[PDB]
Amino acid sequence: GGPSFPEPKVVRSQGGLLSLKLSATPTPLAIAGQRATLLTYGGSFPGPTLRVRPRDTVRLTLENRLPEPTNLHWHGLPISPKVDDPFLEIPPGESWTYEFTVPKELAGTFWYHPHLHGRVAPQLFAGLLGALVVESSLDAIPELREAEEHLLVLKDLALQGGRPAPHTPMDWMNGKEGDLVLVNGALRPTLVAQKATLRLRLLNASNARYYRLALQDHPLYLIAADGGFLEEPLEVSELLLAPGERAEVLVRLRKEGRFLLQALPYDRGAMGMMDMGGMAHAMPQGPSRPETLLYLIAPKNPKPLPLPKALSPFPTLPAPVVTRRLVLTEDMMAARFFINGQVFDHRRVDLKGQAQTVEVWEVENQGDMDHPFHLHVHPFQVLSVGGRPFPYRAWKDVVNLKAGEVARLLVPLREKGRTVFHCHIVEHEDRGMMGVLEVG
Ligand SMILES: [Cu+2]
Ligand SMILES: [Cu+2]
Ligand SMILES: [Cu+2]
Ligand SMILES: [Cu+2]
Ligand SMILES: [Cu+2]
């Protein structure tokens, strides 16, 4: 409506305090040229971006104006599971105040969304999500300060009768993807760049859709992963963002013109059903159709800044004291999903660890679908996936596993208490692919 490029409204802390009341409410709005009622925080889709600095106080009162219970997960924030409480239920009509201090050693793009087990997928799909940006002193170095910065919330949607389409049985098996492939709730927006270097914060807030990102004629310079900066920029030709992952990239516009940002074809192992004679058997859907995410218009005679030579040194972690093995398996036709052969039970503790120790987690995907594995509260360092060493050091909290692959994670245990790990194809979490970690 206003600036060519739609981005969520930003709410900033004031004098070190971000005090805000958000309502979760069915909201009529215009989206992608049609009128629809979505479930929104703060009356908008996506919800407002919260922008804070380390050591700020966040005081967020969530008013539940939905007809079902809900809660908030502060995705990626290494804060206490007593605040980021995955078992809390806020009944319809009730409110709850989340109060926490932003950790001192923290930077990057995080997000908030519901985490009430069994109702996550319908609520997230309906529009309940927003970003949280932790700004850092590193944002003052000239190579970042002088770049043009934008948030890109990647989230798809399907509408039916002016509401989010309901989940089908097949949706619970695959994770629901929609035909409206949106950026900040907008359909294929145009970004008319004014600076030759762009700094793009990227958030995959979809239930299940993957974004194999590629900018026409350009590489991307990765500078942050889910939970923090890399140590130095990493040049990549494309960047896969699984559900729940974040990244930040620098884009260095090489010449005038129009360049498409696309989600290239990607096969995550979703399944259909076919009947060819007697059959009635499951069959791969194959790769996603390519999608145009936005149009990027370069400015006249672009002369991008030099890349930063360094970002943030990654901490040297203490030697680990235990190795864990978590195997992921599937029962596709039952839409049931397991970790070490079990479905979630909120009464059952599955792993018991010691705060301020480091653990090695070997997560093995023995299913046929991609599974993006997420751990609350305790960001990790991905060492390797599928036997390939990871090409950078940075904090992550979601790691994608293709079929058969093992991820080896270095997991420093931070805040004490009971938290969860789960697949971030949230339909799979709702259907049991989640476990309980207790840190003492
Ligand atoms: Cu999440
Ligand atoms: Cu979670
Ligand atoms: Cu199906
Ligand atoms: Cu299948
Ligand atoms: Cu999964």
* 3-class state of residue 430 by DSSP: helix
Is 218 among the annotated ligand-binding positions?
no
Q: How far is ligand 4, taken at its centre, from the CA of residue 176, in Å?
A: 14
Q: Give dist(CA 82, CA 64) in Å, integer.
A: 19
Q: H/E element holding 94?
A: none
Ordered DSSP codes for 23-50: EEEEEEEEETTEEEEEEEETTBSSPPEE
In which order are the strands placed within the sheet that holds 351-353?
Answer: 351-353, 434-439, 417-423, 371-375, 398-401
Query: Same structural domain for residues 160 and 301?
Result: yes
Classify the C-alpha dihedral 41-44-49-50 as positive or negative.
negative
Q: How far is ligand 5, taken at its centre, from the CA of residue 374, in Å?
A: 10
Question: Which ligand ends up closest to the CA of 368?
Answer: 4
Query: Same structural domain for residues 322 and 248?
Result: no
Of 259, 128, 262, 241, which Cα lies nearest the Cα of 185? 128
Using the 8-state DSSP alphabet, how is residue 195 labeled?
Answer: S
Question: Which ligand ends up closest to the CA of 375?
Answer: 2
Is 346 among the annotated ligand-binding positions?
no
Is 75 among the annotated ligand-binding positions?
yes
Query: Same structural domain for residues 20 and 155?
Result: no
Is 113 among the annotated ligand-binding positions?
yes
Q: How far is ligand 3, taken at its centre, from the CA of residue 209, in Å?
A: 16
Q: What value, to the nearest 5°, has the Cα angle with vertex 110 and ends 173 and 48?
A: 95
Q: How far is ligand 2, taken at its centre, from the CA of residue 223, in Å?
A: 25
Q: How far is ligand 5, taken at its centre, from the CA of residue 96, in Å?
A: 30
Query: Same structural domain for residues 191 and 85?
Result: no
- Bridge partners of 423, per DSSP, are 373
Question: Which ligand ends up closest to the CA of 244?
Answer: 1
Q: Give dist(CA 250, CA 239) in Å, integer.
A: 12
Is 73 among the annotated ligand-binding positions?
yes
Query: Same structural domain for residues 68 and 52?
Result: yes
Q: Rounded to an integer, what is the distance from CA 297 to the centroid of its chain?
A: 26
Query: Same structural domain for residues 438 and 324?
Result: yes
Helix (H), strand (E), coil (C) string for 106-140: CCEEEEEECCCCCCHHHHHHHCCCEEEEECCHHHH
Q: Give dist(CA 186, CA 182) in Å, integer.
A: 5
Q: How far is ligand 2, taken at its centre, from the CA of residue 304, in Å?
A: 38
Query: Same structural domain for residues 323 and 228?
Result: no
Is 428 among the annotated ligand-binding positions?
yes
Q: H/E element holding 421?
A: strand 417-423
- Who contacts 347 (Cβ-Cβ below 8 Å, separation ≥6)? none
For 258, how many CA atoms within 13 A lie in the half-sphere containing its CB? 5
Is 378 among the annotated ligand-binding positions?
no
Q: How far is ligand 1, taken at its centre, from the CA of residue 163, in Å?
A: 23
Amino acid at 13: S
Tokens of 391: 């090409």
Residue with the two structure tokens 């703060």: 42
Stated length of the chain: 440
Residues with CB under 5 A from ligand 3 (ion): 170
Q: What value, to the nearest 5°, has the Cα angle with vertex 245 and ends 239 and 248?
A: 60
* 3-class state of residue 426 by DSSP: helix
Residue with the two structure tokens 């900066």: 229
Tokens of 88: 């809390």
Q: Give dist(CA 289, CA 241) in Å, integer.
A: 16
Using the 3D structure, point to which of 135, 168, 184 is the last residue of a domain.
135
Tokens of 39: 């479930």
Tokens of 248: 């930040």
Q: How far is ligand 5, taken at its centre, from the CA of residue 370, in Å?
A: 7
Query: Same structural domain for residues 210 and 277?
Result: yes
Q: What value, to the nearest 5°, has the Cα angle with vertex 406 and ends 120 and 109?
A: 45
Q: Give dist(CA 431, CA 179) in Å, integer.
A: 23
Helix, strand counts (H, E) of the chain: 4, 37
Q: Give dist(CA 310, CA 294) in Å, integer.
A: 29
CB 285 within 8 A of CB 271: yes
Using the 8-state DSSP alphabet, how is residue 194 labeled?
Answer: S
Residue 218's φ and ψ, nearest 5 degrees, are -135, 145
Beta strands in 290-348 (DSSP E): 291-298, 322-331, 336-339
Question: Which ligand ends up closest to the CA of 434?
Answer: 2
* 3-class state of residue 333 by DSSP: helix
Tokens of 138: 């590193």
- Bridge partners of 35, per DSSP, are 30
Query: Same structural domain for residues 390 and 268?
Result: no
ω into residue 46 within 30 of 0, thus cis? yes
Q: How far is ligand 4, taken at its centre, from the CA of residue 244, in Å?
A: 22
Is 281 among the annotated ligand-binding positions?
yes
Tokens of 33: 């040229």
CB count within 10 Å of CB 363 equals 23
Query: Same structural domain for residues 355 and 393?
Result: yes
Q: How far is ligand 3, taken at its centre, from the CA of residue 280, in Å?
A: 11
Residue 360's φ and ψ, nearest 5 degrees, are -100, 120
Residue 100's φ and ψ, nearest 5 degrees, are -155, 165
Tokens of 89: 């239920």
Is 167 among the annotated ligand-binding positions?
no
Q: Rounded to an integer, what is the distance from CA 158 to the centroid of its chain?
A: 19
Q: Environment class of residue 343 by beta-carbon count within 10 Å: exposed (0-12), middle (13-18) or buried (19+)?
A: middle
Using the 8-state DSSP alphabet, how is residue 101 labeled?
Answer: E
Question: Which ligand ends up closest to the CA of 284?
Answer: 4
Domain that holds residue 405: 313-440
Query: Same structural domain for residues 146 and 274?
Result: yes
Question: Which ligand ends up closest to the CA of 271?
Answer: 4
Q: H/E element holding 173?
A: helix 169-174
Question: Which ligand ends up closest to the CA of 421?
Answer: 2
Q: How close are the terminal C-alpha atoms of the chain, in Å?
A: 51
Q: What is the CA radius of gyration of the chain?
A: 21
What's the domain count of the chain? 3
CB 432 within 8 A of CB 344: yes
Q: Give dist(CA 54, CA 114) in Å, integer.
A: 24
Question: Which ligand ends up closest to the CA of 270?
Answer: 4
- Who contacts 176 (Cβ-Cβ below 8 Å, separation ≥6)? 121, 125, 158, 165, 167, 168, 207, 208, 427
Q: Give dist(CA 229, CA 31) in Å, integer.
A: 33
Q: Give dist(CA 75, CA 95) in Å, integer.
A: 20
Residues with CB under 5 A from ligand 4 (ion): 271, 282, 332
Q: Give dist(CA 367, CA 352) in Å, integer.
A: 25
Using the 3D structure, point to which of 135, 162, 188 is the last residue of a domain.
135
Q: Give dist(CA 46, CA 357) in Å, integer.
A: 37
Q: What value, to the nearest 5°, has the Cα angle with vertex 280 and ends 279 and 284?
A: 100
Ordered DSSP codes for 229-283: EEEEEEEES-EEE-TT-EEEEEEE--SSEEEEEEEE------EEEE-SSS--EEE
CB count within 10 Å of CB 299 equals 14
Is 117 among the annotated ligand-binding positions?
no
Q: Residues 158-192, buried b or exposed e (16+ Cβ, 10 A)? A: ebeeeebbebeebbbbbbbbbebbbbbbbeebebe
Question: Which ligand ends up closest to the CA of 111?
Answer: 1
Q: How far is ligand 4, taken at its centre, from the CA of residue 368, in Å?
A: 7
Using the 3D structure, point to which of 118, 135, 152 is the last residue of a domain.
135
Between the alpha carbon of residue 379 and those of residues 93, 124, 191, 256, 390, the distances in Å are 33, 22, 32, 40, 16
Tokens of 49: 């971006």
Query: Same structural domain for residues 117 and 141?
Result: no
Q: How far is ligand 4, taken at its centre, from the CA of residue 341, in Å?
A: 18
